[PDB]
């Protein structure tokens, strides 16, 4: 592996990461208090499968509940105690040391925007009136107020004033803690629309300046005020702006939006397809996650914006062979039968030396998605749901088949 910031000082850690989302939505229910044991036991396999990093569930205990039903997944934690629904504190330390030991850096999902303010028994009790909360200030609607420079989570009553010195400090100390005793190699920031992106850069600078980070900004242009430039900008411009200020890579929701609403040919409009390397290199691509996708168990997970089933192979072949930093959803990899296929694609990625900044060109003269990726080791031609006959039609050089599945609907050639 290779470390290092981008030419723009963005924390993409060498730009050579291949990440595994180490969980799905119903884990706390399907494998009660045993997930950390499972991950430690799977560390060897995960490393062998080709992953360089693993996005772990939120480590802060969550005993919340609601009724569909849910709770305890970590996005409504009541304090930093590690004895939550995924396993014990000791178990977390053992899983993290095993993963880190196998060459898989541990990236922690962190939720700074809010907390289970009403939980009865917690180690973090911030009173009202001191400005620790968003609702300490007048809260007219879902937009920044005097006690919160970001959007709010639902009603906003559990929103923290992450800008308050004490609140900012307690998070900073915990990130240092995670890095110091829980083998964290970086962080995945949750609900980044809820607080200033600059604060994320501050936290990283303070606790893990040279680590890897990714933030999820999930907000369409239509969610911005008509006077805000973002209101008429593209999904790409919006997430790129956040990455600029947070100096952290950002989940490619521009690509996800095209995967959900456009044609496969239109996938080229994701952030990872941008002709400017400073733009695509900060994109963290994915197919589905614990929120957008399905999950084994209860109600099939959240599946708030799930990829059409018949595009799963195409989606993975695309993100694993193109620029940006790819993320593989736990379930596709280990529960639904795409593991072998994904394993092959990861090896194709490493063999060609595709990086977050590798060049990519698109070819519209054929059906489907056709592209040429200039990896550091080899050049790849990718044809998904295309009537392309041979790679020589779009690129010069000696090419050999690297992938050919789904009746040629998924074809990759390498030089």
Q: Is 357 in the site for Ca ion (CB under 5 A)?
A: no
Contact 215, 200 (CB under 8 A): yes
* Residue 350: both structure tokens together: 């490493």
Strand partners, 404: 411
403, containing H or E segment? strand 400-405
User: Among 22, 156, 172, which residue's Cα sits nearest to residue 99?
Assistant: 22
Structure token pair of residue 169? 């400090």
Could you tell me the smallest distance in angstroms from the CB atom of residue 172 to Ca ion? 17
Q: Is 172 annotated as a binding residue?
A: no
20 Cβ contact partners less than 8 Å away, ≥ 6 residues apart:
46, 49, 51, 53, 54, 55, 104, 327, 328, 330, 333
Q: Which of residues 112-141 bind Ca ion (CB under 5 A)?
A: 113
Residue 115 near residue 158, CB atoms below 8 Å: yes
Contacts of 263 (CB under 8 A, 6+ apart): none
**Binding residues with Ca ion: total (CB under 5 A):** 10
Smallest separation, CB 191 to Ca ion (Å): 8
- State which residue, 248 or 265, has the beta carbon closest to Ca ion: 248
Cβ closest to Ca ion, residue 199 vs residue 258: 199
Which CB sits closer to Ca ion, 16 or 331? 16
Query: Per the annotation, does 16 bind a ligand?
Result: yes
Structure tokens at 71: 């709770």
Region label for 118, one of left (φ > 0), alpha (ψ between -120 and 50) or beta (otherwise): alpha
Q: Is 73 in the site for Ca ion (CB under 5 A)?
A: no
The answer to whether residue 262 forms part of the interface with Ca ion (CB under 5 A) is: no
CB 210 → Ca ion: shortest distance, Å? 11
Which residue of 159, 281, 331, 357 would you call a contact of Ca ion, by CB under 5 A? 159
1 known member of a binding site: yes
Q: Is 148 in the site for Ca ion (CB under 5 A)?
A: yes
User: If we measure between CA atoms, which residue out of 58, 46, 60, 61 comes closest to residue 100?
Assistant: 46
Between 94 and 142, CB nearer to Ca ion: 142
**Token reading at 39:** 């991950």
With binding defined as CB under 5 A, does residue 194 bind Ca ion? yes
Do 216 and 235 form a contact (C-beta atoms < 8 A)? no
Active site annotation includes 190:
yes
Q: Is 154 annotated as a binding residue?
A: yes
At closest approach, how far in Å is the CB of 154 from Ca ion? 11
Indicate which residue of 149, 190, 252, 257 is catalytic.
190
User: Is residue 150 close enough to count as binding Ca ion by CB under 5 A?
Assistant: yes
Give the CA radius of gyration of the chain: 21
With tokens 């242009």, the residue in question is 221
Marked catalytic residue, from 149, 216, 257, 357: 216
Binding of Ca ion by 146 (CB under 5 A) = no
Q: Using CB under 5 A, which of 5, 14, 143, 221 touches Ca ion? A: 14
- Bridge partners of residue 362, in order along the sequence: 371
From the list 148-156, 225-233, 300-308, 312-320, the region that binds Ca ion by CB under 5 A is: 148-156
Cβ nearer to Ca ion, comparing 282 with 403:
282
Q: Is 281 in the site for Ca ion (CB under 5 A)?
A: no
- Verify whether residue 216 is a known catalytic residue: yes
- Residue 159's alpha-carbon distances to 107, 154, 183, 201, in angstroms, are 24, 9, 28, 20
Binding site for Ca ion (CB under 5 A): 1-2, 13-14, 16, 113, 148, 150, 159, 194
Return the active site residues: 190, 216
């Amino acid at each position: 592996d290779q470390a290092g910031k981008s030419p723009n000082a963005v924390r993409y850690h060498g730009g050579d990461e291949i990440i595994l989302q180490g969980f799905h939505w119903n884990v706390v229910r399907e494998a009660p208090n045993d997930w950390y044991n499972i991950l430690r036991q799977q560390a060897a396999t995960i490393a062998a499968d080709g992953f360089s990093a693993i996005w772990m569930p939120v480590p802060w205990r969550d005993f919340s509940s609601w009724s569909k039903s849910g709770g305890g997944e970590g996005y409504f934690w009541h304090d930093f105690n590690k004895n939550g629904r995924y396993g014990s504190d000791a178990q977390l330390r053992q899983a993290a040391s095993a993963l880190g030991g196998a060459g898989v850096k541990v990236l922690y999902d962190v939720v700074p925007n809010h907390m289970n303010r009403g939980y009865p028994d917690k180690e973090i009790n911030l009173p009202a009136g001191q400005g620790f909360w968003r609702n300490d200030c007048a809260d007219p609607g879902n937009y920044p107020n005097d006690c919160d420079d970001g959007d709010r989570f639902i009603g906003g009553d559990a929103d923290l004033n992450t800008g308050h010195p004490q609140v900012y400090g307690m998070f900073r100390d915990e990130f240092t803690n995670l890095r110091s005793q829980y083998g964290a190699g970086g962080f995945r920031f949750d609900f980044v629309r809820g607080y200033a992106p600059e604060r994320v850069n501050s936290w990283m600078t303070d606790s893990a300046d040279n680590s890897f980070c990714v933030g999820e900004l999930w907000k369409g242009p239509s969610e911005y005020p008509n006077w805000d430039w973002r209101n008429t900008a593209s999904w790409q411009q919006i997430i790129k702006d956040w990455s600029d200020r947070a100096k952290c890579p950002v989940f490619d929701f521009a690509l996800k939006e095209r995967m959900q609403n456009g044609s496969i040919a239109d996938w080229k409009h994701g952030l990872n397809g941008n002709p400017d390397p400073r733009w695509r290199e900060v994109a963290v691509t994915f197919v589905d996650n614990h929120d957008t996708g399905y999950s084994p168990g209860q109600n099939g997970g959240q599946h708030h914006w799930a990829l059409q089933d018949g595009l799963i192979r195409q989606a993975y072949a695309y993100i694993l062979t193109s620029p940006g930093t790819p993320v593989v959803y736990w379930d596709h990899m280990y529960d639904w039968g795409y593991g072998d296929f994904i394993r092959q694609l990861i090896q194709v990625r490493r063999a060609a030396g595709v990086r977050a900044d590798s060049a990519i060109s698109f070819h519209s003269g054929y059906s489907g998605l056709v592209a040429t990726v200039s990896g550091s080791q080899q050049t790849l031609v990718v044809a998904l749901n295309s009537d392309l006959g041979n790679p020589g039609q779009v690129a010069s050089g000696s090419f050999s088949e690297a992938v050919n599945a789904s009746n040629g609907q998924v074809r990759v050639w390498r030089s």
